[PDB]
Symmetry: C2
Subunit: 249 residues, 2 copies
C-alpha cells in the first residue's frame, strides 16, 4: 500500500492579501474525505496571513526556502525563525533556487540536513534538465542529487524527508511528464532508497511529481504505483488545486 499522499501548493513569488484570502476560503470550503497531507507554501511575508486564515484540517504551511542559522544574513529567513513562528515544513532545493540562486547539490544537501536536525518536514527537490534528459543522463543526475542529500542524513532523518521529482523542462512550460516518464524515475529513485537506505524507508517515503501538474492530468499520474502526490506551482494559485487534492484518492 502507498504511504499517505501529499498535495503541495508552491505559490512561488505570488499573491496579494485579497487574492490569498479568497483562495484560502476556497481551500477551506473544500471538504476533504481521505487521508492526504495538503501543504501550502506562501511567500515568507504571507505566512502569518495564511496561518490566520487557513483552517482546513488536512493542511500544513511550509516555507519555500530557508537558511540554516540566524545571524548577519540581510534579507534571509532562517530555520530557527520559521520553527518559532510555527512553520515546520520547508521546500529545499527547488530548481529555481538551484538555477537562479546558486544552490549546488552540496548547498541543498547541507540545508536539508540542517532542516531535519531542527525538526522540519522537508520537501527536497530533484530533477534533470532538458539537455540532461536528451543525453540519457536522467538517472545519473537524479541519483547524484539524491545521494548528495542522503550522505548528510542519518537513517532516522528520512522519516522527515519527502522527495519531489520535478523535471526542469516540465516546470511552468505547459509540458507535463507523462505518467510513464514520471513512474520510470520514481521507480528508480525508490530502488536506490531501498538499496542504500533501507526497505522500510523506501516503503514509507513519499516521492512526489511536479512540473505542470493540473486538475486534468493529476489522476492518471497518481495511478502510477511509485507516485505519492504532487508539488504544484501554477495550478496551486487556482481553484483547481481542490481537484488535484482529490486526484490523490
Amino acid at each position: 500500500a502507498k504511504p499517505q499522499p501529499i498535495a503541495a501548493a508552491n505559490w512561488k513569488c505570488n499573491g496579494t492579501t485579497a487574492s490569498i484570502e479568497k483562495l484560502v476560503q476556497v481551500f477551506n470550503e473544500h471538504t476533504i474525505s481521505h487521508d492526504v497531507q495538503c501543504v501550502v507554501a506562501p511567500t515568507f511575508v504571507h505566512i502569518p496571513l495564511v496561518q490566520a486564515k487557513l483552517r482546513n484540517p488536512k493542511y500544513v504551511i511550509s516555507a519555500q526556502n530557508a537558511i540554516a542559522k540566524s545571524g548577519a544574513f540581510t534579507g534571509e529567513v532562517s530555520m530557527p525563525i520559521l520553527k518559532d513562528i510555527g512553520v515546520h515544513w520547508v521546500i529545499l532545493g527547488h530548481s529555481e533556487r538551484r538555477t537562479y540562486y546558486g544552490e549546488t547539490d552540496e548547498i541543498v544537501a547541507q540545508k536539508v540536513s540542517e532542516a531535519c536536525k531542527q525538526g522540519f518536514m522537508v520537501i527536497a527537490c530533484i530533477g534533470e534538465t532538458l539537455q540532461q534528459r536528451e543525453a540519457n543522463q536522467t538517472a545519473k543526475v537524479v541519483l547524484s542529487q539524491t545521494s548528495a542529500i542522503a550522505a548528510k542524513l542519518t537513517k532516522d532523518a528520512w522519516n522527515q524527508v519527502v522527495l519531489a521529482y520535478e523535471p526542469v523542462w516540465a516546470i511552468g512550460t505547459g509540458k507535463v511528464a507523462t505518467p510513464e516518464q514520471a513512474q520510470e524515475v520514481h521507480l528508480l529513485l525508490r530502488k536506490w532508497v531501498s538499496e542504500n537506505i533501507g526497505t522500510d524507508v523506501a516503503a514509507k517515503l513519499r516521492i512526489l511529481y511536479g512540473g505542470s501538474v493540473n486538475a486534468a492530468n493529476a489522476a492518471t499520474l497518481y495511478a502510477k504505483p511509485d507516485i505519492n502526490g504532487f508539488l504544484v506551482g501554477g495550478a496551486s494559485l487556482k481553484p483547481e488545486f481542490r481537484d488535484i487534492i482529490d486526484a490523490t484518492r
Copy 2:
C-alpha cells in the same frame, strides 16, 4: 540645515516572536521629541508581527531585500507583494547581499530603479572593502557604486533615495569608522550628487553611516555636517537603539 535624520534598524536574520514583542514594546515606550524618521527592518516573516505591534509614530517598517517582479521565483519576495502588504521602504544592496548573494552593482542599481518606480523609499547601501581602502580606492569605489545606481534613476526619483555608506570592514566587526573617516566619504558623496544630480537634490539627500554604530559613538558621528543618521545592525536588536535615535537630535 541638515535634512530630516533617519535612524534605521537592520535586524538582519534575527528574532523570535517573544524577543520582537519585547523590543518593540521598548521602542514604543521611548517617546521621541524631535523630527526623525525611524525605520525597523525585520525579516520578511516578522513583518506582520511588527506591523501589528509597533505603534511609535516616528517609525516605518522596511524590508531587508526584495526582487522587482512577482512570478516563478521560489523563496523570494517581490516589490509588489511588499507594497500590497503595506511596506513601502526597502534596504537594497546591503554588503551581505553584494558579497554572499551575488548582487553586483548592476543588480543593485536595477533593484533600486524598480523600487523607486514602484513608489518605495529606498535605503541603498554602498561601501568599500578593507582591501579597497588600503589601496586608496575608497572614493572610486563608492562613486562607482553610486553612479551605477544614478544611471538608472530620473532626477525626481532621488526624493525616494537614501544612501547608506557602510565600510565593509566596519560591519559587525567591533571597528566603527571614526567621525573623520565617515565625514570624508559623506562629503565626497554629497559633492558627486550635487555636481551630477543637482544642488537641490544634494541638500535634501540623507546619507547615513553604518558599521558598528552604537549608543556611545553615535552622537559624535552625527555631529559631522554630512552625516544624516545611521543604519544599525547589532545595536538595533538592543534597547540602546533608543539612544542612537536620540543621538540624531
